[PDB]
């Protein structure tokens, strides 16, 4: 027996719960396990879109040895804080993908990814912990994505790109491919703005916007 | 017995007829009902891509009590004019979606929407009359879309956006999310240009272009 | 009996091989035929992502009368050179599409197209030799695409556009629709940069960038 949850019942979680249901009901063939929202804004349990929603105290208190959680909070500092809490409390991080999520050959993705509908993860890609790939995003050949990286919808991450930990790539951003000899690097905790067209390495902690991308 | 039609046999209609066939043949499981084009440019009936095409006089003259029409004309002033005519003549507005159109939880869409392939309508979205969501467009969590709103392909409408009646959002436009406290508003009859990156409220009747979006 | 191949085992080929397998195993229902990589960088045979990879000398030497090749090299000058070699050596050019590739009515596509997942080819489109439509690209109503045209991912080619031979359209580029009276032309060997917003005819051999698109 198992219990599943989506951690976060705001916009991120409510748009991932259908995806978590595709993962659980169809890709895992599991019509038996219950799935709930966790949200620490809650004191008393409520329902959100027809699902039981409870705080983490209540979720921990459930008498089941086999808990699986997708963290659906886009802020990667919160996501890492919650991931470390879950693992310390013996709760499993749970990767979710949609029926229309395309995974190609020799792809490695750490536990707890949120892979939205219409996402492509292409050939020979490596992805670290609790990756968020929102609707329509792709990661193309030979990319290395670090830990707690967050893509908005419709991110175009071309080939031979290395994205370091905690980077955020905004809606519809386009990133030029690197080369095998010189991967294009997005530095740790960098922010690429919505619609930015990234043609060069982005420094760690930089915010870049526009076409072409410039420091903000 | 029923008769279906796509109103408009130009580019909008010819790229929606396959979608209307997915809706009718697969999602409604209906292999019996006939589907035709209506186009008032026609005097004599013709065929368009292997479908009978006739003007509205001829379509009205069909002896069937149960008519269903998708309006495939992108100009929203024409679309509203035709919708009001159809309803007055006792003809039903017909929502069409593709096999790859994704509708999430607690979504409300008024009759007569054209929801193209690869469209996502995410959690807790409300949409008014004869919405056009062209290929790859999405409407994310908590949005409220008014009447006769038109999206070109690949519109990125993020969460907590309110789009008023008759707005037009151009190809690949990106709209910044609002907040629960302050939805980002696109005003009545506003035009957001292709590739525009919208980061603030757009006034009613405004035309905005570029990255970032500015008045034209 | 037949032998299939993907010509090019770098990023283009490795992200197309899964698509070639969807085409062969599912759309052609063929679990019998072998599929390999050809790559002329190879001296001795190797494996690439669990597929045999050999140079063209070795591929020619295979004793089979019925060879089918998808050219997965994005550089269209190389692609044409290889296509002419294959045809001269009595090897068939092979069109591949994904399970999520959408082809609409009255579409004509010459042999040897690479049609990626989530690609739409809309109504009444005509496409010439060895077309590349990378992930998420679309070609909308009434377009005419010439020979050895290459789309990066997420190209938005709207209606009534004529793209001449050997043009390259970069990641996330948007092209304004033409009219029936005046198709918007992308000239021979033109390059449209990533994220370019094309609102007018592009001259043959021009490089255009930005929003709006300008000569570089
Ligand atoms: C880039 C970004 C992080 C900057 O955030 P911020 O510092 O709060 O910026 P503000 O909204 O205060 O705007 C700063 C200025 O830059 C502009 N700007 C903001 N985002 C921009 C963008 N992506 N491209 C270009 N200009 C942008 C604003 O219009 C403003 O101009 P002004 O000073 O003349 O008024 C933010 O706008 C962004 O792009 N975030 C991603 C949104 C997104 O992807 N949503 C998807 C959710 S699923
Ligand atoms: C924004 C828009 C409505 C303006 O239309 P318009 O007033 O007829 O504009 P024009 O085509 O005459 O061009 C006006 C100027 O702005 C530029 N321009 C036009 N559209 C632009 C856009 N989206 N972004 C930036 N610049 C744009 C033109 O290049 C031109 O520059 P110029 O005066 O230096 O020559 C139109 O270009 C547009 O974006 N429409 C949407 C197209 C689309 O989404 N098609 C999908 C069909 S399914
Ligand atoms: C437009 C393009 C062909 C130009 O290539 P290039 O001539 O080698 O250009 P460079 O990378 O040397 O950069 C030239 C300058 O223009 C800028 N630039 C490059 N591409 C740009 C683009 N698409 N939009 C805007 N500016 C761009 C660069 O930042 C640079 O600015 P700088 O001189 O101030 O440093 C190329 O950048 C491009 O867009 N290619 C498509 C990439 C792609 O689609 N990849 C998908 C692979 S599947
Ligand atoms: C306001 C805003 O920009 N929200 C965007 C954000 O959604 P969330 O990541 O759900 O961010 P929220 O701040 O809206 O919500 C986080 C939720 O997480 C909960 N939370 C947070 C911390 C914690 O320790 N426990 C916990 O339960 C918290 O109570 C809240 O309900 O990320 C999505 C990917 C965005 N999506 C789109 C399409 O625009 C949302 O608009
Ligand atoms: C020229 C142009 O920009 N056409 C774009 C428009 O297609 P339509 O909405 O089909 O616009 P049209 O003007 O081309 O056609 C409208 C059709 O509607 C018919 N019509 C119009 C009025 C009416 O009362 N009756 C009626 O039958 C009219 O005869 C005509 O055949 O909207 C699509 C969504 C665009 N798509 C793309 C991908 O570019 C088309 O290019
Ligand atoms: C470095 C680079 O920009 N590669 C991009 C290119 O991938 P390819 O078209 O695979 O280009 P390559 O130069 O990387 O490889 C071509 C292959 O083709 C082979 N080749 C070339 C010539 C020939 O005669 N025989 C032959 O076998 C050659 O040995 C090589 O392995 O085109 C894709 C569509 C891009 N995709 C993305 C998503 O970024 C790749 O990053
Ligand atoms: Cl897309």
Most informative mutation of C197, C199, C215 for ligand 2 (most atoms within 8 A of CB): C199
- The DSSP call for residue A203 is P
Strand pairing of C144-145 and C126-127?
parallel
**Are B78 and B173 found together in one domain?**
no
CA B49 to chain centre: 21
Rounded Cα distance between B151 and B148, Å, is: 10
What subunits touch chain C, counting only 3 or more CB pairs under 8 A?
Answer: A, B
Atom of ligand 6 nearest to the CA of C75: 9
Residue partners of B78: CB distance under 8 A and separation at least 6: none
Please choose, from the candidates A83, A62, A70, the residue with its C-alpha nearest in 3D space to the C-alpha of residue A20: A70
Q: Tell me which residue has its CA closest to atom 33 in ligand 4.
A: A12
**Are B115 and B66 found together in one domain?**
no
Instruction: Round to the nearest angstrom and report the end-to-end CA distance of chain B.
Output: 50
Query: Are the beta carbons of C134 and C117 closer than 8 angstroms?
Result: no
**Are B52 and B136 found together in one domain?**
no
Domain holding A177, by residue range, is: 97-209
Which structural technique was applied?
A: X-ray
Coil, strand or helix: which one is A87? Answer: helix
Nearest CA in chain A to C136: A136
B212-216 contacts at long range (C-beta below 8 A, 24 or more positions apart) = B212/A209, B212/A210
What's phi and psi for C107, nearest 5 deg?
Answer: -100, 135
**Are B181 and B201 found together in one domain?**
yes
Rounded Cα distance between B145 and B158, Å, is: 12
**Are B74 and B105 found together in one domain?**
no
Q: Nearest Cβ partner of B194 from C123, C142, C197? A: C197
Q: Is C117 on the interface with B (CB under 8 A)?
A: no
Please choose, from the candidates C16, B83, C13, C125, the residue with its C-alpha nearest in 3D space to the C-alpha of residue A120: C16
Q: Tell me which residue has its CA closest to atom 29 in ligand 2.
A: C199
Is there a domain that residue C200 lies in?
A: yes
Rounded Cα distance between C107 and C91, Å, is: 24
Domain boundary among B79, B94, B109: B94
Query: Are the beta carbons of C164 and C148 closer than 8 angstroms?
Result: no
Residue C60 has which token pair?
């020619």
Query: Are the beta carbons of A139 and A157 closer than 8 angstroms?
Result: yes
Query: Are the beta carbons of A61 and A44 closer than 8 angstroms?
Result: no
Coil, strand or helix: which one is A23? Answer: helix
Please choose, from the candidates C168, B9, C123, the residue with its C-alpha nearest in 3D space to the C-alpha of residue C198: C168
Q: Is A17 on the interface with B (CB under 8 A)?
A: yes
Rounded Cα distance between B95 and B99, Å, is: 13
For residue C39, what is the domain's CATH number?
Answer: 3.40.50.20
Query: Are the beta carbons of C103 and C119 closer than 8 angstroms?
Result: no
Torsion of CA C182, C184, C185, C191, to 10 degrees: 170
Coil, strand or helix: which one is C19? Answer: helix
CA distances from B140 to A13, A134, B107, B210, C110 (A): 12, 11, 11, 22, 38
Cβ–Cβ below 8 Å for C11 and A159: yes
The alpha carbons of chain A give a radius of gyration, in whole angstroms, of: 17
Torsion of CA B124, B126, B132, B135, to 10 degrees: 0
Is there a domain that residue A215 lies in?
A: no
Is there a domain that residue A61 lies in?
A: yes
Coil, strand or helix: which one is B157? Answer: strand
DSSP C28-81: S--SSSEEEEE-TT-SS-EEETTEEEE-HHHHHHS--S-EEEEE----HHHHHH
**How far, in Å, from the CA of B199 to the mean position of ligand 2?**
19
- Dmax over CA atoms of chain A, in Å, equals 55
Which of B191, B195, B210 has the most C C-beta neighbours within 10 Å, making it the best mutation to test the interface with C? B195
Cβ–Cβ below 8 Å for A49 and B105: yes
Contacts of B98 in chain C (CB under 8 A): 102
Instruction: Round to the nearest angstrom and report the end-to-end CA distance of chain A.
Output: 50
Is there a domain that residue A78 lies in?
A: yes
Q: Is C15 on the interface with A (CB under 8 A)?
A: yes
Is there a domain that residue C215 lies in?
A: no
- The DSSP call for residue B11 is H
Contacts of A102 in chain C (CB under 8 A): 18, 98, 100, 117-118
Query: Are the beta carbons of C102 and B100 closer than 8 angstroms?
Result: yes
**Are C117 and C127 found together in one domain?**
yes
Q: Is C22 on the interface with A (CB under 8 A)?
A: no
CA distances from C72 to A135, C14, C38, C52, C131 (A): 26, 9, 10, 16, 10
Verify whether ligand 6 is closer than 6 Å to residue C8 (CB atom).
Answer: yes
Coil, strand or helix: which one is B83? Answer: helix
Q: Is C147 on the interface with B (CB under 8 A)?
A: no
Query: Are the beta carbons of C199 and C185 closer than 8 angstroms?
Result: no
DSSP B106-121: T-EE-TT-EE-TT-EE
For residue C117, what is the domain's CATH number?
Answer: 2.160.10.10
Count, residues in chain C: 216
Domain boundary among C31, C61, C94: C94
Contacts of A209 in chain B (CB under 8 A): 212
Helix (H) / strand (E) containing B78: helix B76-88
Helix (H) / strand (E) containing C15: helix C11-21
Q: Could you check whether the bond before residue A107 is cis, i.e. omega within 30 degrees of 0? A: no
What's phi and psi for A101, nearest 5 deg?
Answer: -75, 125
Please choose, from the candidates A132, A18, A35, A147, the residue with its C-alpha nearest in 3D space to the C-alpha of residue A80: A147
C27-34 contacts at long range (C-beta below 8 A, 24 or more positions apart) = C27/C97, C27/C99, C30/C2, C32/C1, C33/C1, C33/C2, C33/C3, C33/C4, C34/C3, C34/C4
Count of CA atoms in the C-beta half-sphere (13 A) of B176: 17
Is there a domain that residue C173 lies in?
A: yes
Residue partners of C110: CB distance under 8 A and separation at least 6: C127, C128, C129, C130, C131, C147
Is there a domain that residue A14 lies in?
A: yes
Verify whether ligand 2 is closer than 6 Å to residue C2 (CB atom).
Answer: no
**Are C122 and C204 found together in one domain?**
yes
Residue partners of A14: CB distance under 8 A and separation at least 6: A48, A49, B104, B105, B122, B123, B124, B141
Q: Nearest Cβ partner of B210 from C120, C123, C211? A: C211
Please choose, from the candidates C197, C195, C215, C198, the residue with its C-alpha nearest in 3D space to the C-alpha of residue C206: C215
Residue partners of C39: CB distance under 8 A and separation at least 6: C7, C8, C9, C10, C13, C48, C53, C54, C55
Phi-psi region of C54 (alpha: psi -120 to 50; beta: other; left: phi over 0): beta
Rounded Cα distance between B109 and B128, Å, is: 6
* Resolution stated for this PDB structure, in Å: 1.5
Nearest CA in chain C to A143: C11
Positive or negative: CA dihedral B59, B65, B66, B70: positive
Q: Nearest Cβ partner of A138 from C18, C153, C211? A: C153
Atom of ligand 5 nearest to the CA of C177: 39
Q: Taking the CB of residue A216, how many other CB atoms lie within 10 A of it?
A: 11
Rounded Cα distance between A73 and A38, Å, is: 11
**Are C101 and C203 found together in one domain?**
yes
Nearest CA in chain A to C12: A141
Strand pairing of A102-103 and A67-71?
unpaired
Q: Nearest Cβ partner of A176 from C14, C117, C194? A: C194
Atom of ligand 5 nearest to the CA of C142: 41
Contacts of C170 in chain B (CB under 8 A): none
**Are A104 and A63 found together in one domain?**
no
Q: Is C194 on the interface with A (CB under 8 A)?
A: yes
Nearest CA in chain C to A196: C195
Is there a domain that residue C195 lies in?
A: yes
Cβ–Cβ below 8 Å for C177 and B118: no
**Are A41 and A70 found together in one domain?**
yes
Rounded Cα distance between B68 and B71, Å, is: 10
Rounded Cα distance between A150 and A131, Å, is: 6
CA distances from C113 to A147, A207, C9 (A): 37, 39, 17
Q: Is A187 on the interface with B (CB under 8 A)?
A: no
Domain boundary among C94, C116, C133: C94
Catalytic center residues of C: 141
Q: Taking the CB of residue B112, how many other CB atoms lie within 10 A of it?
A: 25
Verify whether ligand 4 is closer than 6 Å to residue A11 (CB atom).
Answer: yes
Q: Tell me which residue has its CA closest to atom 25 in ligand 1.
A: B212
Query: Which residue among the candidates A141, A162, A164, A166 is catalytic per the annotation?
Result: A141
| Residue indicated by tokens 């029923």 | B2
Full strand arrangement of the beta sheet holding A132-133: A96-97, A114-115, A132-133, A150-151, A168-169, A191-192, A207-209, A214-215
Burial of A107 per CB tally in 10 Å (0-12, 13-18, 19+): middle
Q: Could you write out the three-class secondary structure of C149-161?
A: CEECCCCEECCCE
Residue partners of B216: CB distance under 8 A and separation at least 6: B193, B207, B208, B209
Burial of A34 per CB tally in 10 Å (0-12, 13-18, 19+): middle
Cβ–Cβ below 8 Å for A136 and C136: yes
Contacts of B140 in chain A (CB under 8 A): 11, 15, 135, 153
Rounded Cα distance between A153 and B154, Å, is: 11
Torsion of CA B124, B129, B130, B136, to 10 degrees: -20
Positive or negative: CA dihedral A102, A106, A109, A110: positive
Cβ–Cβ below 8 Å for B153 and C159: no
What's phi and psi for A162, nearest 5 deg?
Answer: -115, 115
**How far, in Å, from the CA of A39 to the mean position of ligand 1?**
28
Please choose, from the candidates A166, A155, A165, the residue with its C-alpha nearest in 3D space to the C-alpha of residue A115: A155
**Are B105 and B194 found together in one domain?**
yes
What's phi and psi for C208, nearest 5 deg?
Answer: -125, 145
**Counted domains in chain A:** 2
Torsion of CA A142, A145, A151, A153, to 10 degrees: 20
Cα of A99 to nearest chain C Cα, Å: 11
Breaks (C-N over 2.5 A) in chain A follow: none
Coil, strand or helix: which one is A128? Answer: coil
Q: Nearest Cβ partner of B105 from A50, A100, A152? A: A50
Burial of B216 per CB tally in 10 Å (0-12, 13-18, 19+): exposed
Q: Is A123 on the interface with C (CB under 8 A)?
A: yes
**Are A121 and A43 found together in one domain?**
no
């Amino acid at each position: 027996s198992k219990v599943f949850a989506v951690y976060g019942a705001s916009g991120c979680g409510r748009s991932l719960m259908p995806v978590a249901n595709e993962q659980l009901r169809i890709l895992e063939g599991d019509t038996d396990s219950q799935i709930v929202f966790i949200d620490d804004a809650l004191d008393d349990n409520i329902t959100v879109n027809g699902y039981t929603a409870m705080n983490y105290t209540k979720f921990k208190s459930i008498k089941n040895d086999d808990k699986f959680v997708l963290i659906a909070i886009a802020n990667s500092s919160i996501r890492q804080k919650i991931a470390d809490k879950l693992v310390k409390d013996g709760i499993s991080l749970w990767t979710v993908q949609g029926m229309t999520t395309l995974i190609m050959d020799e792809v490695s993705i750490d536990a707890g990814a949120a892979l939205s509908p219409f996402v492509t993860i292409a050939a020979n890609v490596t992805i670290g912990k609790c990756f968020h790939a929102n609707l329509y995003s792709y990661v193309e050949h030979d990319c290395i994505i670090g830990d707690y990286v967050t893509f908005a919808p419709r991110v175009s991450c071309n080939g031979n790109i290395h994205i370091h930990d905690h980077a955020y790539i905004g809606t519809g951003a386009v990133i030029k491919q690197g080369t095998p000899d010189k991967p294009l690097i997005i530095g740790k905790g960098a922010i690429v703005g919505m619609g930015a067209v990234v043609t060069k390495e982005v420094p760690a902690g930089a915010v870049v916007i526009g076409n072409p991308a410039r420091l903000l």
